[PDB]
Amino acid sequence: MRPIPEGYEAVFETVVTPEMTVRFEELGPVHPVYATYWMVKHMELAGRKIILPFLEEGEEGIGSYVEARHLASALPGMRVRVVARHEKTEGNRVYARVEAYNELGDLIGVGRTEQVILPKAKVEALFRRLKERWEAE
Amino acid sequence: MRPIPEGYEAVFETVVTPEMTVRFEELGPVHPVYATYWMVKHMELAGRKIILPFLEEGEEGIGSYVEARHLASALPGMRVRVVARHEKTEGNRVYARVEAYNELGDLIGVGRTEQVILPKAKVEALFRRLKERWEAER
């Protein structure tokens, strides 16, 4: 992977849909606002946009870690902007800091993600081996 | 809220479905395995099951923090079990540790969550204030 510039920024913009509110299996609807786990999905997405421009032939990125602190809320129908910035790269691991804002400009979340860069063949091999073990059962 | 016993555990079990694999807006399908954000959703779910039995009338819990390290994979069709454990409660903040396993028993993820306990009226007021501010733009 080519070296990612320090502070390289990638963004993901969306609008909170009804399907993005806090709703769990078993428990059902909980809160009529943008869910933390949806924010996490979008933070991972913004983080992935940081590495795509730099991936070399046969390389792939896989999510390895995520953390997010939910500071404020975003209501259904509101625009949401997620901004990921390259913090550093250690070996084959890319670190990014992320921030999310709602339509009114409120900071609704802060987080960090880690992505591991591996040959697509290696990734396929890992999933392949897991499948074999499962079949062996 | 009634005091939660130290080490109190709650579990959530499910089967990985195709809808739970790594797939993003704009980018599309990425990896055919249980997604980290889906694991996070389920860790939040297990964590909430910890406070529900202790919430007193009028109280509510809201997710405040989530953290997860994805160690191994879970394939579609595999059973997954998420275990949340009450670590401690400070003020109105409940701290829980979480660990997840796939059908083969592999540790697929470890993390932590934080939930804030507040009166349902307070929660509704917070969402209401936000909506009033949004309306104020028009």
PDB file of C-alpha atoms in Angstrom:
ATOM      1  CA  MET A   1       0.000   0.000   0.000  1.00  0.00           C
ATOM      2  CA  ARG A   2       1.282   3.461  -0.895  1.00  0.00           C
ATOM      3  CA  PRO A   3       1.955   5.717   2.114  1.00  0.00           C
ATOM      4  CA  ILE A   4      -1.152   7.539   3.312  1.00  0.00           C
ATOM      5  CA  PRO A   5      -0.526  11.244   4.032  1.00  0.00           C
ATOM      6  CA  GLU A   6      -0.891  12.232   7.676  1.00  0.00           C
ATOM      7  CA  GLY A   7      -4.341  13.670   8.245  1.00  0.00           C
ATOM      8  CA  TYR A   8      -5.687  12.387   4.913  1.00  0.00           C
ATOM      9  CA  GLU A   9      -9.451  12.907   5.074  1.00  0.00           C
ATOM     10  CA  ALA A  10     -12.371  10.917   3.671  1.00  0.00           C
ATOM     11  CA  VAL A  11     -16.035  11.660   4.298  1.00  0.00           C
ATOM     12  CA  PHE A  12     -19.362   9.859   4.176  1.00  0.00           C
ATOM     13  CA  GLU A  13     -22.594  11.822   4.030  1.00  0.00           C
ATOM     14  CA  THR A  14     -26.063  10.381   4.461  1.00  0.00           C
ATOM     15  CA  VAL A  15     -29.528  11.198   5.742  1.00  0.00           C
ATOM     16  CA  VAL A  16     -30.943   9.282   8.690  1.00  0.00           C
ATOM     17  CA  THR A  17     -33.581   6.869   7.407  1.00  0.00           C
ATOM     18  CA  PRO A  18     -36.267   5.241   9.609  1.00  0.00           C
ATOM     19  CA  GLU A  19     -34.304   1.987   9.389  1.00  0.00           C
ATOM     20  CA  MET A  20     -31.309   3.628  11.102  1.00  0.00           C
ATOM     21  CA  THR A  21     -32.949   4.187  14.499  1.00  0.00           C
ATOM     22  CA  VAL A  22     -32.211   2.140  17.637  1.00  0.00           C
ATOM     23  CA  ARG A  23     -34.080  -1.149  17.138  1.00  0.00           C
ATOM     24  CA  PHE A  24     -32.953  -4.558  18.406  1.00  0.00           C
ATOM     25  CA  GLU A  25     -33.886  -8.171  17.822  1.00  0.00           C
ATOM     26  CA  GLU A  26     -35.982  -9.443  20.751  1.00  0.00           C
ATOM     27  CA  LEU A  27     -36.362  -5.973  22.299  1.00  0.00           C
ATOM     28  CA  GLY A  28     -37.817  -4.093  19.338  1.00  0.00           C
ATOM     29  CA  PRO A  29     -37.776  -0.271  18.912  1.00  0.00           C
ATOM     30  CA  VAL A  30     -35.877   1.555  21.668  1.00  0.00           C
ATOM     31  CA  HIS A  31     -35.030   5.134  20.635  1.00  0.00           C
ATOM     32  CA  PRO A  32     -36.238   7.125  17.583  1.00  0.00           C
ATOM     33  CA  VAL A  33     -32.744   8.426  16.759  1.00  0.00           C
ATOM     34  CA  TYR A  34     -29.678   7.487  14.667  1.00  0.00           C
ATOM     35  CA  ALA A  35     -28.276   4.331  16.297  1.00  0.00           C
ATOM     36  CA  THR A  36     -24.739   4.049  17.631  1.00  0.00           C
ATOM     37  CA  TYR A  37     -24.166   0.865  15.628  1.00  0.00           C
ATOM     38  CA  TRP A  38     -25.251   2.643  12.439  1.00  0.00           C
ATOM     39  CA  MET A  39     -22.837   5.461  13.258  1.00  0.00           C
ATOM     40  CA  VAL A  40     -20.154   2.803  13.685  1.00  0.00           C
ATOM     41  CA  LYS A  41     -20.957   1.306  10.281  1.00  0.00           C
ATOM     42  CA  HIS A  42     -20.607   4.737   8.696  1.00  0.00           C
ATOM     43  CA  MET A  43     -17.377   5.477  10.566  1.00  0.00           C
ATOM     44  CA  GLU A  44     -15.956   2.226   9.170  1.00  0.00           C
ATOM     45  CA  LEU A  45     -17.154   3.273   5.725  1.00  0.00           C
ATOM     46  CA  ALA A  46     -15.478   6.678   5.994  1.00  0.00           C
ATOM     47  CA  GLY A  47     -12.328   4.961   7.231  1.00  0.00           C
ATOM     48  CA  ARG A  48     -12.307   2.550   4.295  1.00  0.00           C
ATOM     49  CA  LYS A  49     -12.481   5.473   1.862  1.00  0.00           C
ATOM     50  CA  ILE A  50      -9.140   6.571   3.307  1.00  0.00           C
ATOM     51  CA  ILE A  51      -7.319   3.402   2.220  1.00  0.00           C
ATOM     52  CA  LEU A  52      -8.900   2.672  -1.173  1.00  0.00           C
ATOM     53  CA  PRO A  53      -6.856   5.311  -3.061  1.00  0.00           C
ATOM     54  CA  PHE A  54      -3.643   3.743  -1.753  1.00  0.00           C
ATOM     55  CA  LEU A  55      -4.269   0.001  -2.043  1.00  0.00           C
ATOM     56  CA  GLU A  56      -1.831  -1.710  -4.399  1.00  0.00           C
ATOM     57  CA  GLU A  57      -2.476  -4.678  -6.699  1.00  0.00           C
ATOM     58  CA  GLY A  58      -4.100  -7.646  -4.984  1.00  0.00           C
ATOM     59  CA  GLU A  59      -4.464  -5.837  -1.656  1.00  0.00           C
ATOM     60  CA  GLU A  60      -7.561  -5.677   0.523  1.00  0.00           C
ATOM     61  CA  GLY A  61      -8.540  -3.989   3.765  1.00  0.00           C
ATOM     62  CA  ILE A  62     -10.439  -5.583   6.637  1.00  0.00           C
ATOM     63  CA  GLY A  63     -11.978  -3.908   9.671  1.00  0.00           C
ATOM     64  CA  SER A  64     -10.151  -4.863  12.860  1.00  0.00           C
ATOM     65  CA  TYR A  65     -11.275  -2.370  15.492  1.00  0.00           C
ATOM     66  CA  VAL A  66     -13.807   0.367  16.141  1.00  0.00           C
ATOM     67  CA  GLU A  67     -14.825   2.560  19.059  1.00  0.00           C
ATOM     68  CA  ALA A  68     -17.391   5.327  19.212  1.00  0.00           C
ATOM     69  CA  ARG A  69     -18.709   7.673  21.863  1.00  0.00           C
ATOM     70  CA  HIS A  70     -22.222   8.950  21.174  1.00  0.00           C
ATOM     71  CA  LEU A  71     -22.304  12.598  22.253  1.00  0.00           C
ATOM     72  CA  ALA A  72     -25.480  14.012  20.712  1.00  0.00           C
ATOM     73  CA  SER A  73     -28.317  12.732  18.535  1.00  0.00           C
ATOM     74  CA  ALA A  74     -29.450  12.832  14.917  1.00  0.00           C
ATOM     75  CA  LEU A  75     -33.167  12.544  14.186  1.00  0.00           C
ATOM     76  CA  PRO A  76     -34.676  10.596  11.279  1.00  0.00           C
ATOM     77  CA  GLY A  77     -34.631  12.859   8.226  1.00  0.00           C
ATOM     78  CA  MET A  78     -31.523  14.765   9.325  1.00  0.00           C
ATOM     79  CA  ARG A  79     -28.365  14.928   7.262  1.00  0.00           C
ATOM     80  CA  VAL A  80     -25.310  13.335   8.891  1.00  0.00           C
ATOM     81  CA  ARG A  81     -21.670  13.909   7.954  1.00  0.00           C
ATOM     82  CA  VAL A  82     -18.944  11.471   9.033  1.00  0.00           C
ATOM     83  CA  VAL A  83     -15.323  12.596   8.732  1.00  0.00           C
ATOM     84  CA  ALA A  84     -12.436  10.127   9.013  1.00  0.00           C
ATOM     85  CA  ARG A  85      -8.816  11.265   9.122  1.00  0.00           C
ATOM     86  CA  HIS A  86      -5.683   9.149   8.826  1.00  0.00           C
ATOM     87  CA  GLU A  87      -3.911   9.146  12.185  1.00  0.00           C
ATOM     88  CA  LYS A  88      -1.026   6.777  11.453  1.00  0.00           C
ATOM     89  CA  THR A  89      -0.053   3.490   9.823  1.00  0.00           C
ATOM     90  CA  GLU A  90       1.784   0.766  11.778  1.00  0.00           C
ATOM     91  CA  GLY A  91       3.005  -2.037   9.555  1.00  0.00           C
ATOM     92  CA  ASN A  92      -0.110  -3.264   7.757  1.00  0.00           C
ATOM     93  CA  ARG A  93      -2.497  -1.535  10.167  1.00  0.00           C
ATOM     94  CA  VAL A  94      -4.154   1.811   9.367  1.00  0.00           C
ATOM     95  CA  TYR A  95      -5.441   3.988  12.226  1.00  0.00           C
ATOM     96  CA  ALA A  96      -8.108   6.637  11.683  1.00  0.00           C
ATOM     97  CA  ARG A  97      -9.847   9.127  13.966  1.00  0.00           C
ATOM     98  CA  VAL A  98     -13.463   9.871  13.131  1.00  0.00           C
ATOM     99  CA  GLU A  99     -16.061  12.518  13.943  1.00  0.00           C
ATOM    100  CA  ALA A 100     -19.762  12.624  13.080  1.00  0.00           C
ATOM    101  CA  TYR A 101     -21.998  15.699  12.860  1.00  0.00           C
ATOM    102  CA  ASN A 102     -25.745  16.154  12.444  1.00  0.00           C
ATOM    103  CA  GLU A 103     -27.546  18.622  10.152  1.00  0.00           C
ATOM    104  CA  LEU A 104     -27.374  21.420  12.741  1.00  0.00           C
ATOM    105  CA  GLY A 105     -23.614  21.054  13.013  1.00  0.00           C
ATOM    106  CA  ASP A 106     -23.697  19.350  16.420  1.00  0.00           C
ATOM    107  CA  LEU A 107     -20.861  16.900  17.097  1.00  0.00           C
ATOM    108  CA  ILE A 108     -22.809  13.673  17.578  1.00  0.00           C
ATOM    109  CA  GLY A 109     -19.910  11.274  17.849  1.00  0.00           C
ATOM    110  CA  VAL A 110     -16.176  10.730  18.073  1.00  0.00           C
ATOM    111  CA  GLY A 111     -14.365   7.481  17.398  1.00  0.00           C
ATOM    112  CA  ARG A 112     -11.409   5.565  16.029  1.00  0.00           C
ATOM    113  CA  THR A 113     -10.981   2.630  13.684  1.00  0.00           C
ATOM    114  CA  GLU A 114      -8.276   0.153  12.720  1.00  0.00           C
ATOM    115  CA  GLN A 115      -8.054  -1.606   9.369  1.00  0.00           C
ATOM    116  CA  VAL A 116      -5.605  -4.345   8.429  1.00  0.00           C
ATOM    117  CA  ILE A 117      -4.159  -4.516   4.923  1.00  0.00           C
ATOM    118  CA  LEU A 118      -3.717  -8.028   3.537  1.00  0.00           C
ATOM    119  CA  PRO A 119      -3.437  -9.746   0.144  1.00  0.00           C
ATOM    120  CA  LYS A 120      -6.899 -10.631  -1.154  1.00  0.00           C
ATOM    121  CA  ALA A 121      -5.614 -14.201  -1.456  1.00  0.00           C
ATOM    122  CA  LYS A 122      -4.739 -14.253   2.245  1.00  0.00           C
ATOM    123  CA  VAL A 123      -8.205 -12.983   3.179  1.00  0.00           C
ATOM    124  CA  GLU A 124      -9.874 -15.616   1.009  1.00  0.00           C
ATOM    125  CA  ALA A 125      -7.628 -18.264   2.556  1.00  0.00           C
ATOM    126  CA  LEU A 126      -8.706 -17.272   6.068  1.00  0.00           C
ATOM    127  CA  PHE A 127     -12.418 -17.493   5.265  1.00  0.00           C
ATOM    128  CA  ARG A 128     -11.730 -20.719   3.373  1.00  0.00           C
ATOM    129  CA  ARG A 129     -10.038 -22.336   6.371  1.00  0.00           C
ATOM    130  CA  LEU A 130     -12.887 -21.322   8.680  1.00  0.00           C
ATOM    131  CA  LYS A 131     -15.381 -22.930   6.309  1.00  0.00           C
ATOM    132  CA  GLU A 132     -13.365 -26.155   6.236  1.00  0.00           C
ATOM    133  CA  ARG A 133     -13.310 -26.359  10.030  1.00  0.00           C
ATOM    134  CA  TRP A 134     -17.056 -25.791  10.141  1.00  0.00           C
ATOM    135  CA  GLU A 135     -17.689 -28.542   7.585  1.00  0.00           C
ATOM    136  CA  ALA A 136     -15.407 -30.843   9.586  1.00  0.00           C
ATOM    137  CA  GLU A 137     -18.085 -30.668  12.287  1.00  0.00           C
TER     138      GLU A 137
ATOM    139  CA  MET B   1     -31.998   1.679  39.247  1.00  0.00           C
ATOM    140  CA  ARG B   2     -31.467  -1.287  41.554  1.00  0.00           C
ATOM    141  CA  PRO B   3     -27.764  -2.164  42.013  1.00  0.00           C
ATOM    142  CA  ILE B   4     -26.460  -4.588  39.379  1.00  0.00           C
ATOM    143  CA  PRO B   5     -24.358  -7.428  40.839  1.00  0.00           C
ATOM    144  CA  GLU B   6     -20.697  -7.285  39.879  1.00  0.00           C
ATOM    145  CA  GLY B   7     -20.139  -9.798  37.098  1.00  0.00           C
ATOM    146  CA  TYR B   8     -23.835 -10.044  36.225  1.00  0.00           C
ATOM    147  CA  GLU B   9     -24.110 -11.477  32.706  1.00  0.00           C
ATOM    148  CA  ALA B  10     -26.633 -11.246  29.882  1.00  0.00           C
ATOM    149  CA  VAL B  11     -26.405 -13.066  26.563  1.00  0.00           C
ATOM    150  CA  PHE B  12     -27.679 -12.610  23.032  1.00  0.00           C
ATOM    151  CA  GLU B  13     -27.577 -15.445  20.538  1.00  0.00           C
ATOM    152  CA  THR B  14     -28.333 -15.420  16.838  1.00  0.00           C
ATOM    153  CA  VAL B  15     -27.445 -16.971  13.507  1.00  0.00           C
ATOM    154  CA  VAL B  16     -25.421 -14.982  10.999  1.00  0.00           C
ATOM    155  CA  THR B  17     -27.588 -14.109   8.004  1.00  0.00           C
ATOM    156  CA  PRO B  18     -26.491 -12.773   4.611  1.00  0.00           C
ATOM    157  CA  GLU B  19     -27.841  -9.378   5.678  1.00  0.00           C
ATOM    158  CA  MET B  20     -25.202  -9.285   8.425  1.00  0.00           C
ATOM    159  CA  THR B  21     -22.104  -9.369   6.195  1.00  0.00           C
ATOM    160  CA  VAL B  22     -19.798  -6.433   5.407  1.00  0.00           C
ATOM    161  CA  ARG B  23     -21.685  -4.255   2.904  1.00  0.00           C
ATOM    162  CA  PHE B  24     -21.476  -0.454   2.652  1.00  0.00           C
ATOM    163  CA  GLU B  25     -23.457   2.289   0.978  1.00  0.00           C
ATOM    164  CA  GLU B  26     -21.624   3.547  -2.130  1.00  0.00           C
ATOM    165  CA  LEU B  27     -18.989   0.783  -1.935  1.00  0.00           C
ATOM    166  CA  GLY B  28     -21.269  -2.253  -1.924  1.00  0.00           C
ATOM    167  CA  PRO B  29     -20.304  -5.808  -0.785  1.00  0.00           C
ATOM    168  CA  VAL B  30     -16.849  -6.080   0.801  1.00  0.00           C
ATOM    169  CA  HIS B  31     -16.513  -9.272   2.883  1.00  0.00           C
ATOM    170  CA  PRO B  32     -18.884 -12.298   3.113  1.00  0.00           C
ATOM    171  CA  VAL B  33     -18.632 -12.515   6.909  1.00  0.00           C
ATOM    172  CA  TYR B  34     -20.330 -11.219  10.074  1.00  0.00           C
ATOM    173  CA  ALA B  35     -19.705  -7.454  10.024  1.00  0.00           C
ATOM    174  CA  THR B  36     -18.051  -5.544  12.853  1.00  0.00           C
ATOM    175  CA  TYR B  37     -20.919  -3.042  13.003  1.00  0.00           C
ATOM    176  CA  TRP B  38     -23.407  -5.908  13.330  1.00  0.00           C
ATOM    177  CA  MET B  39     -21.326  -7.374  16.159  1.00  0.00           C
ATOM    178  CA  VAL B  40     -21.419  -3.930  17.787  1.00  0.00           C
ATOM    179  CA  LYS B  41     -25.206  -3.808  17.488  1.00  0.00           C
ATOM    180  CA  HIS B  42     -25.434  -7.176  19.219  1.00  0.00           C
ATOM    181  CA  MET B  43     -22.956  -6.189  21.948  1.00  0.00           C
ATOM    182  CA  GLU B  44     -25.129  -3.136  22.600  1.00  0.00           C
ATOM    183  CA  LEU B  45     -28.105  -5.491  22.720  1.00  0.00           C
ATOM    184  CA  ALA B  46     -26.466  -7.849  25.227  1.00  0.00           C
ATOM    185  CA  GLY B  47     -25.397  -4.841  27.269  1.00  0.00           C
ATOM    186  CA  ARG B  48     -28.946  -3.504  27.424  1.00  0.00           C
ATOM    187  CA  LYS B  49     -30.200  -6.889  28.635  1.00  0.00           C
ATOM    188  CA  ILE B  50     -27.992  -6.317  31.673  1.00  0.00           C
ATOM    189  CA  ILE B  51     -29.776  -3.165  32.845  1.00  0.00           C
ATOM    190  CA  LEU B  52     -33.385  -4.024  31.945  1.00  0.00           C
ATOM    191  CA  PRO B  53     -33.978  -6.276  35.007  1.00  0.00           C
ATOM    192  CA  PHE B  54     -32.789  -3.478  37.297  1.00  0.00           C
ATOM    193  CA  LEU B  55     -34.409  -0.351  35.859  1.00  0.00           C
ATOM    194  CA  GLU B  56     -36.977   1.142  38.219  1.00  0.00           C
ATOM    195  CA  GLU B  57     -40.266   2.639  37.021  1.00  0.00           C
ATOM    196  CA  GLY B  58     -39.718   5.721  34.877  1.00  0.00           C
ATOM    197  CA  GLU B  59     -36.054   4.975  34.154  1.00  0.00           C
ATOM    198  CA  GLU B  60     -34.450   4.438  30.766  1.00  0.00           C
ATOM    199  CA  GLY B  61     -31.031   3.526  29.437  1.00  0.00           C
ATOM    200  CA  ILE B  62     -29.234   5.077  26.472  1.00  0.00           C
ATOM    201  CA  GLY B  63     -26.107   3.871  24.688  1.00  0.00           C
ATOM    202  CA  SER B  64     -23.131   6.159  25.276  1.00  0.00           C
ATOM    203  CA  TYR B  65     -20.020   4.232  24.250  1.00  0.00           C
ATOM    204  CA  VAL B  66     -19.087   1.107  22.297  1.00  0.00           C
ATOM    205  CA  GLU B  67     -15.734  -0.470  21.504  1.00  0.00           C
ATOM    206  CA  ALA B  68     -14.982  -3.713  19.675  1.00  0.00           C
ATOM    207  CA  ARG B  69     -11.931  -5.559  18.394  1.00  0.00           C
ATOM    208  CA  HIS B  70     -12.764  -8.140  15.732  1.00  0.00           C
ATOM    209  CA  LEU B  71     -10.503 -11.145  16.365  1.00  0.00           C
ATOM    210  CA  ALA B  72     -12.054 -13.925  14.290  1.00  0.00           C
ATOM    211  CA  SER B  73     -14.823 -14.429  11.751  1.00  0.00           C
ATOM    212  CA  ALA B  74     -18.319 -15.899  11.748  1.00  0.00           C
ATOM    213  CA  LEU B  75     -19.743 -17.237   8.480  1.00  0.00           C
ATOM    214  CA  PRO B  76     -23.367 -16.863   7.348  1.00  0.00           C
ATOM    215  CA  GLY B  77     -25.381 -19.700   8.872  1.00  0.00           C
ATOM    216  CA  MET B  78     -23.135 -19.967  11.937  1.00  0.00           C
ATOM    217  CA  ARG B  79     -24.496 -19.434  15.423  1.00  0.00           C
ATOM    218  CA  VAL B  80     -23.007 -16.537  17.383  1.00  0.00           C
ATOM    219  CA  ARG B  81     -23.222 -15.853  21.111  1.00  0.00           C
ATOM    220  CA  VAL B  82     -22.533 -12.455  22.642  1.00  0.00           C
ATOM    221  CA  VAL B  83     -21.846 -12.258  26.371  1.00  0.00           C
ATOM    222  CA  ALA B  84     -22.049  -8.972  28.269  1.00  0.00           C
ATOM    223  CA  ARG B  85     -20.747  -8.708  31.825  1.00  0.00           C
ATOM    224  CA  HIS B  86     -21.403  -5.897  34.272  1.00  0.00           C
ATOM    225  CA  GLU B  87     -18.044  -4.445  35.274  1.00  0.00           C
ATOM    226  CA  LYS B  88     -19.166  -1.505  37.397  1.00  0.00           C
ATOM    227  CA  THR B  89     -21.652   1.331  37.772  1.00  0.00           C
ATOM    228  CA  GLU B  90     -20.466   4.864  38.504  1.00  0.00           C
ATOM    229  CA  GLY B  91     -23.171   7.416  39.117  1.00  0.00           C
ATOM    230  CA  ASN B  92     -25.687   6.899  36.324  1.00  0.00           C
ATOM    231  CA  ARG B  93     -23.169   5.209  34.017  1.00  0.00           C
ATOM    232  CA  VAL B  94     -23.114   1.427  33.589  1.00  0.00           C
ATOM    233  CA  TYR B  95     -19.883  -0.176  32.342  1.00  0.00           C
ATOM    234  CA  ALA B  96     -19.944  -3.595  30.691  1.00  0.00           C
ATOM    235  CA  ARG B  97     -17.379  -5.914  29.115  1.00  0.00           C
ATOM    236  CA  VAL B  98     -18.388  -7.916  26.045  1.00  0.00           C
ATOM    237  CA  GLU B  99     -17.077 -11.043  24.323  1.00  0.00           C
ATOM    238  CA  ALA B 100     -18.501 -12.879  21.321  1.00  0.00           C
ATOM    239  CA  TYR B 101     -18.038 -16.423  20.047  1.00  0.00           C
ATOM    240  CA  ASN B 102     -18.886 -18.237  16.837  1.00  0.00           C
ATOM    241  CA  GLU B 103     -20.403 -21.717  16.544  1.00  0.00           C
ATOM    242  CA  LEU B 104     -16.979 -23.380  16.671  1.00  0.00           C
ATOM    243  CA  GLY B 105     -16.257 -21.673  19.972  1.00  0.00           C
ATOM    244  CA  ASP B 106     -13.714 -19.234  18.531  1.00  0.00           C
ATOM    245  CA  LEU B 107     -13.482 -15.872  20.272  1.00  0.00           C
ATOM    246  CA  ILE B 108     -14.572 -13.574  17.442  1.00  0.00           C
ATOM    247  CA  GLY B 109     -14.639 -10.302  19.340  1.00  0.00           C
ATOM    248  CA  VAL B 110     -14.033  -8.460  22.595  1.00  0.00           C
ATOM    249  CA  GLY B 111     -15.189  -5.011  23.636  1.00  0.00           C
ATOM    250  CA  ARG B 112     -16.853  -2.738  26.170  1.00  0.00           C
ATOM    251  CA  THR B 113     -19.921  -0.539  26.351  1.00  0.00           C
ATOM    252  CA  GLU B 114     -21.182   2.320  28.470  1.00  0.00           C
ATOM    253  CA  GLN B 115     -24.842   3.134  29.050  1.00  0.00           C
ATOM    254  CA  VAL B 116     -26.318   6.147  30.804  1.00  0.00           C
ATOM    255  CA  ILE B 117     -29.393   5.762  33.006  1.00  0.00           C
ATOM    256  CA  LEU B 118     -31.864   8.661  32.921  1.00  0.00           C
ATOM    257  CA  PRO B 119     -35.572   9.313  33.524  1.00  0.00           C
ATOM    258  CA  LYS B 120     -37.594   8.522  30.399  1.00  0.00           C
ATOM    259  CA  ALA B 121     -38.939  12.071  30.664  1.00  0.00           C
ATOM    260  CA  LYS B 122     -35.407  13.463  30.444  1.00  0.00           C
ATOM    261  CA  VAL B 123     -34.631  11.355  27.378  1.00  0.00           C
ATOM    262  CA  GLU B 124     -37.811  12.508  25.642  1.00  0.00           C
ATOM    263  CA  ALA B 125     -36.999  16.117  26.552  1.00  0.00           C
ATOM    264  CA  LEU B 126     -33.543  15.809  24.988  1.00  0.00           C
ATOM    265  CA  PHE B 127     -34.953  14.501  21.713  1.00  0.00           C
ATOM    266  CA  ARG B 128     -37.702  17.132  21.820  1.00  0.00           C
ATOM    267  CA  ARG B 129     -35.239  19.994  22.271  1.00  0.00           C
ATOM    268  CA  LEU B 130     -33.263  18.721  19.285  1.00  0.00           C
ATOM    269  CA  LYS B 131     -36.374  18.617  17.110  1.00  0.00           C
ATOM    270  CA  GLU B 132     -37.366  22.147  18.160  1.00  0.00           C
ATOM    271  CA  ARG B 133     -33.911  23.405  17.149  1.00  0.00           C
ATOM    272  CA  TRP B 134     -34.256  21.671  13.784  1.00  0.00           C
ATOM    273  CA  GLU B 135     -37.696  23.236  13.264  1.00  0.00           C
ATOM    274  CA  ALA B 136     -36.197  26.631  14.144  1.00  0.00           C
ATOM    275  CA  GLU B 137     -34.241  26.447  10.886  1.00  0.00           C
ATOM    276  CA  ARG B 138     -37.591  27.016   9.149  1.00  0.00           C
TER     277      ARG B 138
END
